[PDB]
């Protein structure tokens, strides 16, 4: 496979044993092109790895043409805006082949990085996989309790869900009030209010308090 | 899905613009594909007065060519380029297909009843005229009064090109992003 | 909202659908100005993030005109003198929108950084919020037991409170003795002793042992 | 609350001085506003012989304009600038308002009884004369012997300007920070 | 005290109130000299802090003339060869005044850094001090069980103590054998063997196998 | 021993006491050669230590001629592609002499770094060695349960073992199918397929679906 | 085990090549020595159609000079250099010793029965001719038809040098790594 | 305890040498002072054949001036400088005080019985002559045969200066560190 790629000269040397008992057909070696270590700057922290280390798993974000989206050219480095202390385990996977789970990291943030970088929770090593499954089970139970649809430890969960909904409604009302204040008299706020003005004046209707 | 394939190669975005768009896209949906639910979650944040889910459904259906179920980055970017920095013909065809809910391309005052209804419903109930139950029907009727001669795509194109006001409003956002 | 700000071209493209069924009023687009990543050096460790990432929450320290107080100009970077391993979660909040709680970090220091940078314990994500509340409850119980006003596990708490008060009194006595020794015969110590001399000689009274 | 608004724009601190002051201020109270309790906690550390809480109360009341309850950074810095690097008139008005406990501006030998009492009490009981119960009253009496002609702000200003010794003692700290 | 040293202009401004009710004695201000942030490179990881931050506790290693022993001049930085992830808490102490205890760090290594840098286990904050005392108690019990003097969970402790003594004896025998081999026929090894030769030939005696 | 090597001038000064009671034989001092700190870049994170610190244990990877394999010359630094947050404990061992065990790190990855860098689980300090042994015991029990040879908490272990075997078989089938597709019509994939072609055509046989 | 000892000093690898080889070698077996089991684990990954363990056993025995039990880095690298970039004579002796299972150097159509059997078995059962039970014997028989004159090392060398096709196939991999 | 105070100011170590010595010293005893127990722990590592604790006790007593109990860095460094790079007179006085166990300065063949006994005992029992119970006494006797004329410090100094061999052996370590 591609995981053991540094042992390609080993396999080629082993293939020499076939030649005496073969009938030389001119198997046409591919005649490849010919290795400086590259930098992955995950929000300030630089991680230096050989490109061949990343290319050995060409179905994820790091080994792909996908990382050309995150190449920042004038600094000659790949800048990701992700967690610096979880990308370490991504590189550790790319080096060996088995993911490790941090016992001290939130599993809802660990899964986010795995989803981002293309890894899957099926390749995490057996050494730390019972605890990963246990914490995933706890997170799933929390989600299920939070999504029991009670509209008409779980009691405080429902209370905090109601508080979160109230906060979302308050944020929506604050955005509407800010737009109203702007109409009466930031960077993105101006464009958002322009969009709201366009929505207003395409239907000859006006927002009021 | 290369970065150079969707470069200025019938996609109107530069390399830096493509990189920024991919960063923003993968920030919300790391899997690289966005579905209808997440589509609505982002769309409803820009319009907090009402609910834009009804309009976001038709918007996603327009974005989701071939009805795959989830729209990936390549077709998302080409749709954005067509809508923002595309030509008149592409924008008008995209809008016509957005209004055209069914497979064949027709508009019969019932297919786009929902479009105008959603456009009005995504404002909530706080406007000055307090809206009305029959105002979307009035808007649709006055809309049909300028293109529907007897009872199509050619009619839509010629009607849009005849009036310069929709012409000058379509290219509003190509100058700024 | 401002959280989904990278989807502004998306919203503008969506707004094109309104134009056919509109009556073009010349909605007057704002005609904005036009993005290099900035550095946040939190006591040695540099954290690189786009300015637009910070500006999407313009009610905290990082997204504000407040961080202009912490700009260190000749190095062209923002230097904060805070914890390097807790500002990581501040940036993770600025990227997604949900705070994460370190299970391995003291909650009295985690709350300090949240208070400093303007974040609130109400926006921390639901994934790790039961444990944050539990540890906050334990800290509050510790504070309440330490502040039961017994002047006339809790026994050793009272003992360590008395020891801390004795240490504070010893420090005060040592400062007074140091001032006395200076009067008989560091950098800040000279100015502090000058202040004490001013207090002495504004009331024609002298401190003695 | 901008950094440039409170620059050398009637605030006598430079940009670097403002940055240092904000760093030191937010080090103790990260919320950006300091209340009376924390005010006393910092003030009592400089004078460990006695308790400066009594004087720190009046000092906070002088700092806390409009009696909001907690003093923020902007008014804190303008008060510091007035006291340290301000002019004579501003310093004298600030001191007069510090002594003037009540709303209207008057001094009646009872309002500033507490001021001198706190100034003497923030030394503890370790001084050479071992103090006395009536020495703050003697200090207040000798103070009133040089400005109180018959029984105000104008009197305070003219008395301070008449004697050059208080004049040269007020500007002690403007040269060094 | 020196902990609140950035509030010295505050105290000087407060002292202005004494002047009206004073008798100006010319209290002779000290007329001080006049602040670039300095680097502390603790084995690769650089920590940048203002010198005034360190000087506010002038009885430890960092605030002292003692750190002039660890100044590495040509790089213009202080190089310490200590733990990079525990010196963070030393700086956090120097910033606020209260030490924090890492729940994930060995207490025998945490105490080593405190002893090195001059801090004491008496100034660690009350927020995390019950757990510090608990772990110190466990370490002390381990030491006491390991030092019960049984020469003639505790059983395996005695077994590992015997194994450690055997390893020490084996290391001593290996060093003696290495010296013997060198006499029959590294950098520090040559000087150590020269010292052993000096010990041999000052008493006209020779080491043999 | 070599652990206390900075005390060599101490031992030489102590040896002066032998000279008065000696008979000077000209013990022939070795006349040594004569110390800049070197960099160890473990995948992005640089660790600076004196060479004499590493050379004091000349039977492991860091103190040896073995690290000349990992020297990257044009940058004048040693680049290791290992875990950045576990090499810290390797350096801490090289400084003091006792290894510390991270309670938050997987023991199957901690042992990997010890095996790589030449250290052994016998030199880890007594302070954290009961927990290291306990976690090693849990890992060994997991391995034994996973290797009970049931071919015909342990039930889910057998289930995940079967799933892993199925994934391995699927990967093998996918590699074979990829080679078939290449024959019908990456970097390492071309050379691997060339090797497969050589194996095919040395026995005049062809792989088919 | 120095890095300079196994440099271009009868080892055909440069300093950078040795560094890369050691990095890759220690990545899989950090102890610096690889045993038969790990040997098979790496070898079987390159040929997933069948099992290469049978051939990997003889390959390890050829690599493991003096039958120590585990092969270290120095002899591993010298074997790789001999096989890849070595001369004809060294390659032919190495292959002869690989076929020569027993101690003394002889080939008797039974020692290398297993070699050809493993070479055929490492393809699985998916080939077009569906193989056969007697095809390894046919391959061995046709192999013996070109070198076995009457019933050795000299015979193997002269037979290999007589036919230029095996000559040009042996040096296939010296140009590329 | 400054770094510049113990510079080349009657201390024969440079700034870099002082920094290296302090780093090595604080590596073992972070408190900055080393006691007798730790003294023995470092001393016994250099001589593993026997036990050097008996000699390390007298060595610590010589180092620990004024019998404080624990020796700090300043006196440790000045003792090292005197022994290694010091002059003849200082080295001879230091050695005499090392032998002089009691307060007053005298040598009576019983005070230094322990010194030679420890020097012989720090070799263990593995030497070629297998040592003897009476060989330290013979060494002390032959030592007294060259300086003890009738039955002191002046005698020790003159005896050491008379024989050039001890002279040339004393300065063995000043050239190398």
**Are the beta carbons of G153 and G96 closer than 8 angstroms?**
yes
Q: How many CA atoms lie within 13 A of G74 on its CB side?
A: 10
Say whether residue C44 is in contact with chain E using an 8 A CB cutoff. yes
Could you please report the per-residue DSSP string of D27-60? HH-TTSEEEHHHHHHHHHHH--SS--HHHHHHHH
Measured CA to CA, the distance from residue G125 to residue G133 in angstroms comes to 12
Q: What is the CA radius of gyration of chain E?
A: 27
Annotated binding site of B: 100, 102, 104, 106, 111, 148, 150, 155
Cα of G130 vs its chain's centroid, Å: 26
* CB-nearest partner of G128 from F68, F115, F206: F206
Q: What angle do CA D168, D173, E2 make, to 5 degrees?
A: 145
Query: CA-CA distances (angstroms) from residue E3 to B38, C107, C161, D53?
Result: 51, 23, 20, 18
**Burial tier of G170 (Cβ tally within 10 Å: 0-12, 13-18, 19+):** buried
**Are the beta carbons of B110 and B141 closer than 8 angstroms?**
no
Q: How many CA atoms lie within 13 A of F95 on its CB side?
A: 27
Tokens of A88: 């370490």
Query: How many residues are present in chain H?
Result: 177
Check the annotation: does D17 bind a ligand.
no
Nearest CA in chain G to A6: G24
Q: What resolution in Å is listed for this PDB structure?
A: 3.1
Nearest CA in chain F to E174: F1
Alpha helices in chain H (DSSP H): 15-28, 36-46, 53-63, 73-85, 88-99, 113-121, 135-144, 153-162, 164-170
Residues from chain E that touch H122, judged by Cβ atoms under 8 A, are 199
Residues from chain H that touch F95, judged by Cβ atoms under 8 A, are 27
Check the annotation: does D148 bind a ligand.
yes
In chain F, residues preceding a discontinuity (C to N beyond 2.5 A) are 34, 152, 185
Measured CA to CA, the distance from residue B137 to residue B120 in angstroms comes to 11
Measured CA to CA, the distance from residue H61 to residue B144 in angstroms comes to 110
Say whether residue A125 is in contact with chain F using an 8 A CB cutoff. yes
- Domain ranges in chain D are 1-177
**Burial tier of D23 (Cβ tally within 10 Å: 0-12, 13-18, 19+):** middle
User: What is the nearest CA distance from A47 to chain G, expressed in angstroms?
Assistant: 18
Q: In what order do the strands lie in the sheet with C45-49?
A: C45-49, C38-42, C77-80, C71-72
Residue with tokens 């979880």: A86
Q: Three-state SS for A29?
A: coil
β-sheet bridge partners, residue B5: none
DSSP B70: E
What are phi and psi for residue B101, nearest 5 degrees? -70, -45
Nearest CA in chain D to E21: D143
Measured CA to CA, the distance from residue G151 to residue G93 in angstroms comes to 19
Say whether residue F184 is in contact with chain G using an 8 A CB cutoff. no
Q: Which run of H or E residues covers position B144?
A: helix B135-144
* CB-nearest partner of H129 from E116, E195, E205: E205
**Are the beta carbons of C114 and E136 closer than 8 angstroms?**
no
User: What is the nearest CA distance from C114 to chain A, expressed in angstroms?
Assistant: 18
Measured CA to CA, the distance from residue A196 to residue G51 in angstroms comes to 67
Query: Could you tell me whether strands F38-42 and F77-80 are parallel, antiparallel, or unpaired per DSSP bridges?
Result: parallel
**Are the beta carbons of G113 and G134 closer than 8 angstroms?**
no
> What subunits touch chain C, counting only 3 or more CB pairs under 8 A?
A, B, D, E
Torsional class of H13: left (φ above 0), alpha (ψ -120 to 50), beta (otherwise): beta
Measured CA to CA, the distance from residue G133 to residue B100 in angstroms comes to 66
Q: How many CA atoms lie within 13 A of F58 on its CB side?
A: 13
DSSP C48: E
Q: Three-state SS for H34?
A: strand
Nearest CA in chain E to F4: E188
The E residues from 3 to 32 touching C (CB cutoff 8 Å) are 5, 8, 11-12, 15, 18-19, 21-23, 25, 27-30, 32
**Are the beta carbons of E101 and E129 closer than 8 angstroms?**
yes
G119 vs F205: CB contact, 8 Å cut-off?
no
**Are the beta carbons of A104 and C105 closer than 8 angstroms?**
no
The crossing angle, in degrees rounded to 10, of helices G153-162 and G88-99 is: 130
Nearest CA in chain E to D19: E6
> What subunits touch chain E, counting only 3 or more CB pairs under 8 A?
C, D, F, H
Residues 6 or more apart in contact with residue E36 via CB below 8 angstroms: E51
Say whether residue A196 is in contact with chain B using an 8 A CB cutoff. yes
**Are the beta carbons of B94 and B83 closer than 8 angstroms?**
yes
Measured CA to CA, the distance from residue C153 to residue B37 in angstroms comes to 52
Calculated CA dihedral for residues C58, C60, C66, C69, nearest 10 degrees: -140
**Are the beta carbons of F36 and E31 closer than 8 angstroms?**
no
- Measured between its terminal Cα atoms, the distance across chain E in Å is 65
Task: Count Cβ atoms below 10 Å from residue B57 Cβ, excluding itself.
Answer: 16
Fold of C7-146: Potassium Channel Kv1.1; Chain A (3.30.710)
Residues 6 or more apart in contact with residue C157 via CB below 8 angstroms: C142, C145, C146
Say whether residue F48 is in contact with chain H using an 8 A CB cutoff. no
Say whether residue F176 is in contact with chain G using an 8 A CB cutoff. yes
Query: Could you tell me whether strands B33-35 and B70-72 are parallel, antiparallel, or unpaired per DSSP bridges?
Result: antiparallel
Measured CA to CA, the distance from residue A138 to residue D18 in angstroms comes to 49
* CB-nearest partner of G49 from F68, F81, F176: F176
In chain H, residues preceding a discontinuity (C to N beyond 2.5 A) are 151
């Amino acid at each position: 496979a591609a995981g053991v790629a540094a042992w390609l000269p080993f396999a080629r040397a082993a293939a020499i044993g076939w030649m005496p008992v073969a009938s030389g057909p001119m198997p046409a070696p591919p005649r490849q092109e010919r290795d400086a270590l590259i930098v992955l700057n995950v929000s300030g922290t630089r991680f230096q790895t050989w490109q061949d280390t990343l290319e050995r798993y060409p179905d994820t974000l790091l080994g792909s043409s996908e990382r050309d989206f995150f190449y920042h050219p004038e600094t000659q480095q790949y800048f990701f805006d992700r967690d610096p202390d979880i990308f370490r385990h991504i590189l550790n996977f790319y080096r060996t082949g088995k993911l490790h789970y941090p016992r001290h990291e939130c599993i809802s943030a660990y899964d986010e990085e795995l989803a981002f970088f293309g890894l899957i929770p099926e390749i995490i090593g057996d050494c730390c996989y019972e605890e990963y499954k246990d914490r995933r089970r706890e997170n799933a139970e929390r989600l299920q309790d939070d999504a029991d649809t009670d509209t008409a430890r779980a009691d405080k969960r429902r209370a905090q869900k109601k508080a979160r909904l109230a906060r979302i409604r308050a944020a929506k009302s604050g955005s509407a009030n800010a737009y109203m204040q702007s109409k009466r008299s930031s960077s993105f706020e101006t464009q958002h209010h322009h969009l709201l003005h366009c929505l207003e004046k395409t239907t000859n209707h006006e927002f009021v308090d | 899905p290369e970065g150079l394939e969707q470069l200025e190669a019938q996609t109107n975005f530069t390399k830096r613009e493509l990189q920024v768009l991919y960063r923003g896209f993968k920030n919300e949906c790391p899997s690289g594909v966005v579905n209808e639910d997440t589509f609505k979650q982002i769309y409803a944040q820009f319009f907090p007065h009402g609910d834009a889910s009804t309009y976001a459904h038709y918007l996603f259906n327009a974005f989701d060519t071939t009805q795959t179920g989830s729209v990936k980055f390549e077709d998302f970017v080409t749709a954005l380029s067509i809508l923002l920095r595309g030509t008149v013909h592409e924008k008008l065809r995209w809008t016509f297909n957005l209004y055209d809910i069914n497979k064949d391309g027709y508009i019969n005052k019932e297919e786009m009843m929902d479009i105008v209804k959603a456009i009005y419903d995504m404002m909530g109930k706080y406007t000055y005229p307090v809206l009305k139950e029959d105002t979307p029907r009035q808007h649709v009727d006055v809309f049909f009064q300028k293109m529907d001669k007897n009872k199509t795509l050619d009619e839509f194109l010629e009607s849009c090109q005849e009036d310069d006001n929709i012409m000058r409003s379509l290219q509003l956002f190509q100058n700024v992003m």
